[PDB]
Each structure stands twice: as C-alpha cells, then as structure tokens.
C-alpha cells in the first residue's frame, strides 16, 4: 500500500519508494523530482 494515505491503489512500487501516484506527485518536489520539460 501507499505509505502515506492508506491506499492500496496508485502504487509506484518502483525503486522501493512505494508512494501512490497522487501523493508521489505532491512529494515529488521534496524528494528531488522537479519540473524541467
């Protein structure tokens, strides 16, 4: 499940981060992923 919002769904299980796409899009800027292009 997504280690942020109790969600079985949306999971980005890649690289061992396991945040669903909705929360990972928000935490993207704090993780290191920024908008270039």
């Amino acid at each position: 499940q997504c280690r942020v919002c109790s969600s079985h769904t949306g999971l980005i299980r890649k690289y061992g981060l396991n945040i669903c796409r909705q929360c990972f899009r928000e935490k993207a800027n704090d993780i290191g992923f920024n908008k270039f292009r």
Partner: protein
Amino acid sequence: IIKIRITLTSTKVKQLENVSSNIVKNAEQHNLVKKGPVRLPTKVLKISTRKTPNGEGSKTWETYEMRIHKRYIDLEAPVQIVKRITQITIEPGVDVEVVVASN
C-alpha cells in the same frame, strides 16, 4: 604517501563547480600532483507521465526531468591533508567520495 581518487555527484552545477574549483586550487596552492577535474556526461533522467488524471478526455502524455552531473579528481597526499580537506569541503547538494585504492 597516499594516492587517492575523488568523485563528486550533484544536480546543481554551481555548487558542484564551487567544490571542484575549491579542491583544484586548494590542492595546487600547497603543491600536489593531480589530474584535473574530469567531467562525466550529465545524465538526464526522465519520467513519462500521462496528462490524464481523472478519466475525462483522451490520452495525451508528458515528461519530467532531472540532470545529474559527475566529476572526478585524482590526487597524491598524506593522511592528514585528505582528512582535513574531506572535512572542510563537505557541502549540501554536492556528494563527495574519497577512494584510496588504485586497482
């Protein structure tokens, strides 16, 4: 007598080049033998992301990006110079690595 190789990795080129020029000029101003800051290709890590969040409208696509730059400098110095330089050069954003072996 230690022959050491240093490798930096960073996303912000200003801090990385600050640390690089610092180590360069600080290594030559007290007389050391070195190979200048060699520059590995900036790898651009991209992530494909669908435009559609809610299932309304057709499917079109987008892209996110990150630029990762890596440098390396080779040196020959004792134990104390390496310890002190490693402690003094520590910066945020820039990740430094000090390897001793030459195999």
